Amino acid sequence: ELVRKLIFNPQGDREASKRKIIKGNPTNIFELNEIKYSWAFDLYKLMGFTNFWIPEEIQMLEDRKQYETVLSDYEKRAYELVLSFLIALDSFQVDMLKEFGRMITAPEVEMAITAQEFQESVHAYSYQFILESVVDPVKADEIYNYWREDERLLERNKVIAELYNEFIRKPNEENFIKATIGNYILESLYFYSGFAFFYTLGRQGKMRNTVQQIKYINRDELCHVTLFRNIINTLRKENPELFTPEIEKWIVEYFKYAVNEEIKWGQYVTQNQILGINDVLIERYIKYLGNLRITQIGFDPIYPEVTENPLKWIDEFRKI
Amino acid sequence: ELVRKLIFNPQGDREASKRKIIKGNPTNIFELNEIKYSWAFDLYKLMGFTNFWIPEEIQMLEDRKQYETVLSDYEKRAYELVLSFLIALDSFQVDMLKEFGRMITAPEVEMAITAQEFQESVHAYSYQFILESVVDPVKADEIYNYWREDERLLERNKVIAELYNEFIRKPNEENFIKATIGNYILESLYFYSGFAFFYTLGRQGKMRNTVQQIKYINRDELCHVTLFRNIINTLRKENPELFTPEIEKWIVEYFKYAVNEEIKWGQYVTQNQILGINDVLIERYIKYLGNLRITQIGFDPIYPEVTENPLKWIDEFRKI
Ligand SMILES: [Fe+2]
Ligand SMILES: [Fe+2]
């Protein structure tokens, strides 16, 4: 049963060295003259100042034409599914990051979480500006609401909320670690069929305006995964009693389930009808990313057969 | 008993016109193609993009010298009290804004709240950079911790937390309106002895580096008051049953108490020892600001005798 810290605790520890990610005894004064977790303060600076971006400064002059006249029925179906789902993911994140931040007892980590919450809001703004820019108003409302029309998308949204809702209903230590892992998996995997698709359209000079918006979102998402990688690894060191064998088993199962679900979404979205990407590239890509992200929080590769990034070329294409 | 909305509500209203500030039935998808509250989306744009600022881009080359050699014992005492208290206020705000945002049921308002929470984090960063820049490390730790040494400052912090803690412990509709009014009063009044002091030092070319940081903070705080003015006025229209006569009476009492407390702090901090400001200017200034802010949420002036801004010259000095 994780207690939400009071606004001010005059019995709080003065010594930054006594900070904990959770269940610390902070004053809740942001005593940032001393930093226990330098990675959190660095990530705040990076997300908040270094990587600041304004969606509306990205010119959108071309995509409405290419959407109107150059995209296939299949390219438009994928555009709609991917953007609908990304809108849902960042909506869930702006809201759930408030739950993580209010339970965190280390100010520099709370600070990094606030910056991430703001970046998720910038993404929501970017999607509204992409759609205002590219499609007609009824079609924009349709893309926002596409879960009402597509059972696969509706179920994706409901599964993501489940893991977050359990912590909210039942805010205990177990439900916190599971929500924390779920957040890491969402930002590790759930963007990446969508990012791979956009960069595919973009490599053939299709929807490059939309693709520019995506490059800024992807940079943000790499910082978000780095923040949660550090939080999880620090939670293991500081609260080992919470990484029971039941929890360690669950993490590997959920990661494998999430890899498989992201692959199927990618396949559903593209259906081998998208030139330059196919169902097998999608499979090895999501398995590559799963191995990378689960190893980085202290587990063995989950797809030993996959060792290479099948889409190595994205690392370079996505750069700004 | 205000229920925190689930991460995703497939029974949610599609129609933006059905949004409420509180107790709406949202999907919790940020459907920003349609905006019920244009003031909230405008304020998001202003706080998030238009008024973006980087504390560390403000050069701090002069203030360490003037602090070292040019400031009186009284000027240094005030610098320390004001900055200690502002550090406390923005710490409380980054943390409490997560509580408002998770209860808000209108996405554009949640979006504006997220931007405000990020601005409070930028302020915390600014204070750390001001102190790293101007004073030695033990003195910086002393300023962060000055509530441990000064009973008036300790009690100021404890009173601010009280009103927020009651909502957190007992999250009902009454405690929400009281916390919402308390937030408006904090950003209306609790900065303004501190801002008046800094602009006084600055008008005589003292601590102008610190004063530049303050101008950016003050611009932010005017946007924060505008956001809460709109939220309160909209809550009155949408939930009139919550503005009982017991609540309306309480708002006028608390505003009057807060005006009087801010004046006393201002007086305590300056003690008529600060050249260009005195105990009577402070009195009329905080009463002017109280009238302005309580009238703007639908009440009669609380100090009828005060009609003019005794420090009219700040309106112009503070501009960027
Ligand atoms: Fe993210
Ligand atoms: Fe503020």
- Chain B from 4 to 33: CB within 8 A of any A CB: 4-8, 10, 14, 28-33
Query: With an 8 Å Cβ cutoff, is B115 touching chain A?
Result: yes
Rounded CA-CA distance A100/A113 in Å is: 8
Instruction: State the DSSP string of chain B.
Output: --PPPPS--TTS---GGG--SSS----SS--TTS-S-HHHHHHHHIIIIIT---GGGS--SSHHHHHHHTS-HHHHHHHHHHHHHHHHHHHHHHHHHHHHHHH---HHHHHHHHHHHHHHHHHHHHHHHHHHHHS-HHHHHHHHTGGGT-HHHHHHHHHHHHHHHHHHHS--HHHHHHHHHHHHHHHHHTTHHHHHHHHHHHHTTSSHHHHHHHHHHHHHHHHHHHHHHHHHHHHHHH-GGGS-HHHHHHHHHHHHHHHHHHHHHHHHHHTT-STT--HHHHHHHHHHHHHHHHHTTT---S-TT--S-TTTTHHHHT--
Q: What is the DSSP letter of A112?
A: H
* A107 contacts A31 by C-beta, under 8 angstroms: yes
Examine the residue annotation and report whether B254 is marked as an active-site residue of this protein.
no
CA distance B280 to chain A (A): 32
* B255 contacts B290 by C-beta, under 8 angstroms: yes
Query: With an 8 Å Cβ cutoff, is A53 touching chain B?
Result: no
Rounded CA-CA distance B200/B191 in Å is: 14
Say whether A26 sits in a helix, a strand or coil: coil
Q: Maximum Cα–Cα distance for chain A, whole Å?
A: 66
Residues recorded for chain A: 320
> Which structure tokens are listed for B314?
């700040």
Is residue B224 a known part of a binding site? yes
> Which structure tokens are listed for B148?
């441990």
The residue of chain A nearest to residue B33, with distances taken between CA atoms, is A128
Residues in chain A with CB shorter than 8 Å from the CB of B127 are 32
Q: What is each CA distance from B139 to A33, A41, A289, B76, B145, in whole angstroms?
A: 10, 21, 47, 11, 10
Radius of gyration over every alpha carbon of chain B, rounded to an integer in angstroms: 20
Interchain contact, A33 vs B141, CB within 8 Å = yes
> Which structure tokens are listed for B222?
């005017």
Q: Is A34 exposed, middle or buried (0-12, 13-18, 19+ CB in 10 A)?
A: middle
Backbone angles phi, psi at A121, to 5 degrees: -65, -40
* A259 contacts A303 by C-beta, under 8 angstroms: yes
Q: What is each CA distance from B181 to A145, A297, B218, in whole angstroms?
A: 35, 44, 19
CB atoms within 10 A of CB A54: 16
Q: Which residues contact B59 (CB under 8 A, 6 or more apart)?
A: B209
* A58 contacts A74 by C-beta, under 8 angstroms: no
Is residue B187 a known part of a binding site? yes
Percentage helix, strand, coil, to 5, in chain A? 70, 0, 30
Gap from CA of A168 to ligand 2 centroid (Å): 27
Nearest CB among B33, B52, B158 relative to A131 is that of: B33
Of all helices (H) and strands (E), which one includes residue A236? helix A208-238
Rounded CA-CA distance A30/A98 in Å is: 17
Rounded CA-CA distance B276/B273 in Å is: 9
Residues in chain A with CB shorter than 8 Å from the CB of B5 are 95
Gap from CA of A91 to ligand 2 centroid (Å): 24
Residue with tokens 């199927």: A264
Question: Which of the residues of A are catalytic?
Answer: 127
Query: With an 8 Å Cβ cutoff, is B170 touching chain A?
Result: no
Residues in chain A with CB shorter than 8 Å from the CB of B111 are 94, 121, 124-125
Considering every ligand atom shown, identify the ligand nearest to the alpha carbon of residue A116 and give its number: 1
Rounded CA-CA distance B261/B38 in Å is: 35
> Which structure tokens are listed for B228?
């809460």
Considering every ligand atom shown, identify the ligand nearest to the alpha carbon of residue A220 and give its number: 1
Backbone angles phi, psi at B35, to 5 degrees: -125, 115
Is residue A187 a known part of a binding site? yes
Say whether A30 sits in a helix, a strand or coil: coil
| CATH no. for A16-318 | 1.10.620.20
What resolution (Å)?
A: 1.7
What technique was this entry resolved by?
X-ray
Rounded CA-CA distance A31/A122 in Å is: 27
Rounded CA-CA distance B61/B239 in Å is: 52
Radius of gyration over every alpha carbon of chain A, rounded to an integer in angstroms: 20
Residue with tokens 């409380």: B92
Interchain contact, B32 vs A157, CB within 8 Å = no
Interchain contact, A125 vs B32, CB within 8 Å = yes
* A216 contacts A320 by C-beta, under 8 angstroms: yes
Residue of B169, B190, B176 whose CA lies nearest to B257: B190
> Which structure tokens are listed for B100?
């408002």
Gap from CA of B237 to ligand 2 centroid (Å): 24
Backbone angles phi, psi at B42, to 5 degrees: -60, -45
Q: What is the DSSP letter of A243?
A: S
CB atoms within 10 A of CB A40: 25
CA atoms within 13 A on the CB side of B149: 12
Rounded CA-CA distance B202/B195 in Å is: 10
Query: With an 8 Å Cβ cutoff, is A149 touching chain B?
Result: no
Is residue B132 a known part of a binding site? no
Residue with tokens 């100021």: B156
Q: Is A171 exposed, middle or buried (0-12, 13-18, 19+ CB in 10 A)?
A: middle
Rounded CA-CA distance A207/A55 in Å is: 15
**CA end-to-end distance (rounded Å), chain A:** 44
CA atoms within 13 A on the CB side of A178: 22
Residue of A199, A188, A211, A210 whose CA lies nearest to A274: A199
Provide the residue type at A268 as one letter: Y
Q: Which residues contact A139 (CB under 8 A, 6 or more apart)?
A: none
Rounded CA-CA distance B306/B288 in Å is: 6
